[PDB]
Design a protein around this nucleic acid. Structure first.
Ligand SMILES: [Mg+2]
Lengths: 427, 229
DNA sequence: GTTTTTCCATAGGCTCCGCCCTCCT
RNA sequence: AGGAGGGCGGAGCCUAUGGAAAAAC
């Protein structure tokens, strides 16, 4: 028989006016946003975004615009906002490109585009253009028609506020808790070829939040770029907050198993040696290379009154090096728990580490709680993805970039543009 | 406080030592049962030994891997009649045509798939990981088919019916296609029932014969306990 | 005379991509 | 592409262990 431990309770998001709301309850979060607004309300150059579509004289489009304005002004507190309206004759790339050019020429802070239906080459060939120029938010008219307008608009507005440079919420969690730096990994297989992407997440204001993103790297150049990433991320951390020392550096790997020696472990060990040679990291620096996994064959059954599912934050000890981590949970409603499909946990394995046996329990539990915490920092909507940010975001970036490359879109080079590392265009 | 279940099915009895005959590896090695490759040494076990056996206990690190493959081989010879051996290797694959009542069973062959693997932990505890999948086969050519291909070959209504039936056989949704409050418990009940039926067990505990002794499996989910620290 | 790559092999474990649906405050 | 989840189909990746060969030095 195995043992398990649950993340300590009391987890709350942080709101704009310094208050906090209970987690996992979306209605209370929306009420708190109405009362106090987002944690970081964006400052907008033009205070005016655009609504580009082709369904002119449509009541659904008018309701979409009204809901967008109402929620931007009231629940998101982006006051004095203005939504213009642009119409393209046909859904071909040329016409929508002309309309987004007109919207940019008028001067806008973001583009709120409505695509009539599902078309991958158009969508990527045009999203590559948008992310290279301005924050953007696509809609599908068929999906918008068949979905309740309130939930749809609220989720797209979470996405868009985050894309505009805002911070809807941050975890109200201990800042002296968990690792200092995390370098997550994500991959996409195109024609049996892996393209990898790195996310640089580290503590800026005590709170840990996603900071930078990397271009896609080939498997051959994966290790050298991981080395450069470690050096760059520790340099950036020391730049961001002096008076702090680098004590814990965790590295998250997805889509590939890490090599327990002569691989990611070798590169990370050599980088740490070099960094402590320049006295950039602490002498007692503790590192770990982690494997995150969802295609494991394991299923966990929980409390019968919790829909037979484990409570979120449950860490099941498969072995001393591999753990199962429950991240979702049935959400309460005005009437009760909601019917759910069986939920598969997250497999977390420590491929490599530098921890001594005395500190192992504390260090592994710290990294598991921090994975649970950065699970809730996903900003695509009110319900967060099971993946933590450190591996969720690079996976999205790798998918977008590979799709743009295969569909002939405008090249995306994150290294050239600072906003490409520093803004969640991929959400 | 509470109890969690993992779908790992514990093995409460196994031989303490087994007959293992390590021989030099060669390029003409045929990878099959009763023999394993670990580096330059090929280890013979069970009926594959050749009387130069070496007694190795569970304290050895060799025992864990040789016994993983040993369990995979032993359980491959206790398959009941309605189940058929699909593939034997790192995992044991058993398939069974779904003969329960579902519409369009005469054109779409839905079959179960028990993916069986061994989980070892604490250097002495072994177990069986059972994972269930449903294989959708186009019955006329008996070849694997997908929902989109079902809709292409037979229409939208057939595709919807087969989708609902598959998600109900997984017990993730209701037979009418909705979510419900006991899907996870029904999924575990389903896994336990198919494991019991696949290994011919009408009981919780079944024993399997092996040259080094006997293997006893619980055919129940493994409980997980809350530890406070 | 002397470490790196670069291919093999078996044993094991995922792991990406599509599309099919049920749900959301 | 508002997301979240599950399922299915399709390719394969990837680790570990060994092996050799080759070019170094
Ligand atoms: Mg998006």
């Amino acid at each position: 028989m195995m043992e398990y431990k649950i993340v300590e309770n009391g987890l709350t998001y942080r709101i704009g006016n310094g208050a906090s709301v209970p987690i996992s309850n979306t209605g209370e979060l929306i009420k708190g946003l109405r009362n106090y607004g987002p944690y970081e309300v964006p400052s907008l150059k033009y205070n005016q975004i655009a609504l580009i579509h082709n369904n002119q004289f449509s009541s659904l489009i008018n309701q979409l615009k009204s809901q967008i304005s109402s929620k931007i002004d009231e629940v998101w507190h982006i006051h004095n906002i203005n939504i213009s309206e642009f119409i393209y004759d046909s859904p071909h790339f040329d016409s929508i490109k002309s309309q987004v050019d007109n919207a940019i020429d008028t001067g806008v802070d973001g583009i709120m585009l409505v695509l009539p239906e599902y078309n991958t080459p158009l969508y990527y060939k045009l999203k590559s253009y948008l992310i290279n120029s301005i924050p953007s938010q696509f809609m599908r008219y068929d999906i918008l028609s068949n979905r309740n307008l309130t939930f749809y608009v609220d989720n797209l507005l979470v996405q868009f506020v985050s894309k505009l440079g805002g911070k809807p919420w941050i975890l109200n969690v201990d800042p002296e808790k968990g690792s200092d730096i995390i370098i997550g990994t994500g991959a996409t297989r195109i024609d049996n070829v892996n393209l990898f992407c790195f996310a640089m997440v580290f503590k800026k204001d005590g709170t840990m939040l996603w900071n930078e993103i990397s271009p896609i790297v080939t498997s051959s150049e994966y290790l050298t770029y991981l080395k450069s990433t470690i050096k760059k991320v520790v340099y950036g951390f020391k730049k961001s907050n002096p008076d702090w020392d680098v004590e814990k550096l965790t590295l998250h790997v997805s889509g590939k198993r890490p090599k327990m020696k002569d691989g990611e472990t070798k590169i990370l060990k050599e980088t740490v040696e070099e960094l402590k040679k320049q006295e950039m990291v602490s002498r007692d620096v503790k590192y770990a290379i982690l494997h995150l996994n969802e295609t494991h064959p394991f299923w966990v059954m929980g409390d019968p009154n919790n829909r037979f599912h484990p409570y979120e934050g449950t860490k099941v000890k498969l072995s001393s090096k591999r753990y199962l981590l429950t991240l979702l949970q049935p959400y309460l409603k005005r009437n009760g728990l909601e019917m759910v499909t069986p939920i598969k946990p997250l497999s977390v394995e420590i491929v490599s580490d530098n921890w001594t046996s005395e500190e192992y329990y504390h260090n592994v539990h710290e990294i598991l709680d921090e994975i649970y915490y950065l699970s809730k920092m996903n900003w695509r909507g009110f319900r967060s993805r099971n993946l933590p940010v450190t591996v969720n975001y690079p996976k999205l970036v790798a998918g977008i970039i590979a799709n743009v490359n295969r569909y002939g879109g405008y090249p995306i080079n994150p290294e050239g543009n600072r906003s490409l590392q520093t803004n969640p265009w991929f959400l | 406080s509470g109890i969690l279940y993992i779908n790992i099915y514990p093995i409460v009895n196994y031989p303490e030592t087994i007959k293992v005959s390590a021989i030099p590896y060669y390029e003409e090695f045929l990878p099959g049962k009763w023999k394993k490759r670990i580096g330059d040494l090929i280890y013979l076990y069970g009926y594959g030994i050749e009387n130069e056996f070496d007694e190795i206990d569970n304290s050895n690190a060799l025992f864990g891997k040789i016994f993983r493959k040993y369990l995979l081989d032993i359980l491959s010879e206790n398959i009941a009649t309605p189940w058929q051996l699909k593939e034997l290797g790192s995992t044991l694959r058993l398939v069974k045509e779904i003969t329960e009542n579902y519409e369009f069973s005469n054109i779409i062959k839905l079959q179960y798939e028990l993916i069986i693997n061994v989980h070892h932990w604490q250097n002495t505890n072994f177990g069986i990981i059972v994972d269930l999948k449903i294989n959708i086969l186009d019955r006329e050519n008996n070849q694997r088919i997908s929902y989109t291909k079902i809709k292409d070959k037979y229409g939208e209504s057939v595709k919807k019916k087969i989708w609902v039936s598959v998600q109900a056989f997984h017990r993730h949704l209701t037979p009418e296609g909705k979510k419900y409050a006991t899907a996870m418990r029904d999924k575990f009940n389903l896994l336990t029932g198919l494991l019991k039926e696949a290994f011919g067990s009408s009981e919780d505990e079944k024993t399997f014969s092996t040259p080094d002794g006997e293997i006893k499996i619980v055919f129940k989910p493994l409980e997980i306990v809350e530890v406070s620290n």
